[PDB]
Every structure is written in C-alpha cells, then in structure tokens.
Amino acid sequence: MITLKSPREIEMMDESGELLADVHRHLRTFIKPGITSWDIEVFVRDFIESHGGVAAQIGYEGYKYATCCSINDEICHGFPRKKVLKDGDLIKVDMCVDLKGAISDSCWSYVVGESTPEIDRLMEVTKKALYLGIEQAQVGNRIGDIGHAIQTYVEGEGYGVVRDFVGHGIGPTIHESPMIPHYGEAGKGLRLKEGMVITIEPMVNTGTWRMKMDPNGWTAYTEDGGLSCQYEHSLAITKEGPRILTSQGEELTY
C-alpha cells in the first residue's frame, strides 16, 4: 500500500509533471480579473487533454472537475464555478495529471490583478514553507521532519498551518499513503525511503488554522474568515535527494 516506484515509473511521473507544470505556466497569463474559475477549469482540462493526458481528479470519490479553485478564505477543494474573479482575489488552482498512467499533483496560488501587502506576504511565506518542507524530504529522514520544518517557519511568521488536510503518497492514484502532515515533530514517525513519491502541500491561513466544511462535503473555509494559501509539489524520494516532479522552472523563480 505504500508502493515504491522504480526509475522508469519516476521518469514517467516526471513527464506527467512537466505537462502539469506547463499548464501552470500558461495560467500565469490566463488568470485575470473578469474570467470565472469555470473558465480555468475549461482551459486546464482542454490543455491536459489535448496533450494526451487525463485529468485525474475527475471521478475521484465522485469529484466532477479537473481542478479545484479555492478562492480567498476557501482553503481547498473549491469547485470551479461561473463566478467572476476580481482584483485582489487569491485563488489556489489544484489539478492532477495522469499521463499514460503516471500521476502528478500540484496546486499553485495566483493573485488576480492588483495584489495587496497582506497577500504578497502570505503567498511568499507559504511558498517558502513548501520549499523548507521539500528540503526535509531526504532518504532516512522521517515524515515529522517535514511537518516540523513547515510549522516552525509558518508559525514564526504569525500564521496558522492547516491541520485537517495533509500531503500524501501518489501512484497509482492521486491520493495514497502515507499521510504527510504539515505540522509535527522532527524525528517522528515514518521513515522516507528511496522510491517513495509524495506531495508536500502546506495550506497556510492568516489567522486560526481551524476550518469549517461547506454543505457540498468538499470545500473548506477558514473558521475566522482569514485568507488561506497553498503551494504544492509532487516529488520522488531519491539517494540524490528530493526530485521535484512538477517544477515549473528554477525554484522560487515562480
């Protein structure tokens, strides 16, 4: 149930991740005030599919979309909808790609139009946090090292680290064991081994880390109305150290 991938599998997951990365790159100019999150769904789904892939979230546990679009105080699992995006919206776009059977997952945050100081700071903290996480993903370190790197940094900046959602393994589906919490204690619990493929995907809130659920069973809101932010990568645990499968270019450049 935690499967270890072979070099060839990892390779294909890397090719899957390049297509998803490429969708993210194209989102940088497509996302603007006046579009809806439904337009993002349509565009992402057409891009993945016209390049041979399958949007792996469709049918996952009944989910119907290629994408999650979580706006502002929505933390994760927002539905793309025909609601107009505005100046100042912070939208997290989550998508998964299955390219010839190989899975990649990656959520990236975008600010729509003119940003604010509050949003520029939150996004830069969340993204740093992802990368501090990824640093801890070495063969031999343990899963709690990843949570401890993230929580210490996020909390030191004044923010809450969501707790109710966590990273996970990937391959052969979009969501496998093991769990990767984004808070925790260095040196605990499960040990990372070569050939694991996982996501790191901290969700960071400006105020409490607590959430409430929408009636739809999927979408989560911050409990206090603070903005929430997420960045995610898929990565392979290797002897060389973490190989980021969904990289969009040079790290922290984007």
Side-chain angles (χ1 to χ4, degrees):
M1 221 224 355
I2 298 157
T3 52
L4 309 174
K5 289 59 185 188
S6 72
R8 46 234 184 10
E9 298 162 307
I10 291 162
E11 257 308 318
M12 282 175 72
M13 296 174 94
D14 195 60
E15 294 198 357
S16 176
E18 174 50 68
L19 206 207
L20 154 23
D22 193 32
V23 183
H24 279 303
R25 290 198 289 270
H26 281 68
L27 284 176
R28 317 214 273 230
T29 52
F30 176 85
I31 294 174
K32 31 206 47 150
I35 66 166
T36 68
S37 59
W38 181 261
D39 294 329
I40 295 173
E41 164 72 12
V42 167
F43 173 84
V44 167
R45 185 178 182 171
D46 293 2
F47 195 111
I48 291 175
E49 71 187 54
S50 65
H51 287 75
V54 167
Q57 279 187 300
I58 303 163
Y60 178 71
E61 304 196 337
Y63 194 69
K64 297 173 181 170
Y65 310 117
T67 252
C68 297
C69 289
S70 300
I71 285 74
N72 283 345
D73 55 323
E74 294 173 358
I75 295 181
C76 58
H77 298 156
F79 286 176
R81 60 254 193 220
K82 305 178 182 189
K83 178 184 221 263
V84 165
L85 300 173
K86 306 297 225 296
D87 281 282
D89 283 346
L90 170 60
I91 178 165
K92 288 67 81 187
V93 185
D94 184 44
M95 66 190 87
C96 303
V97 171
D98 164 3
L99 184 64
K100 297 133 140 294
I103 308 278
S104 50
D105 293 4
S106 175
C107 183
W108 217 250
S109 288
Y110 294 91
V111 209
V112 181
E114 204 191 337
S115 198
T116 71
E118 171 192 43
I119 284 174
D120 295 325
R121 193 176 163 247
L122 170 72
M123 296 177 239
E124 184 45 29
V125 169
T126 311
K127 187 187 292 178
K128 252 231 244 200
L130 169 58
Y131 285 97
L132 296 170
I134 287 180
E135 262 184 33
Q136 299 297 319
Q138 314 283 336
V139 350
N141 283 7
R142 299 164 90 84
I143 277 176
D145 291 327
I146 287 160
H148 184 69
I150 295 170
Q151 153 182 24
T152 291
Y153 177 67
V154 166
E155 285 175 3
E157 309 281 338
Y159 299 138
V161 58
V162 155
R163 211 141 301 197
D164 297 281
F165 305 92
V166 297
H168 45 80
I170 238 92
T173 71
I174 60 190
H175 192 104
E176 310 282 338
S177 313
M179 289 175 99
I180 136 162
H182 301 110
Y183 60 103
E185 273 144 35
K188 295 174 83 195
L190 183 81
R191 194 97 86 176
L192 269 1
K193 346 219 331 280
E194 237 221 326
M196 276 170 85
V197 303
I198 58 176
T199 64
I200 302 171
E201 61 184 275
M203 282 152 45
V204 172
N205 298 340
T206 56
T208 178
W209 60 262
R210 294 176 223 267
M211 63 86 176
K212 297 296 189 156
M213 290 297 293
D214 190 88
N216 73 22
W218 283 93
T219 311
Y221 299 116
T222 67
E223 193 273 345
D224 59 6
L227 291 180
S228 176
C229 187
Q230 169 172 51
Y231 289 91
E232 161 183 26
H233 280 299
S234 285
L235 48 140
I237 300 313
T238 89
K239 272 149 163 247
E240 178 249 343
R243 130 126 108 156
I244 294 166
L245 311 166
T246 48
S247 181
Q248 298 169 208
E250 266 204 300
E251 306 311 338
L252 278 320
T253 275
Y254 59 91

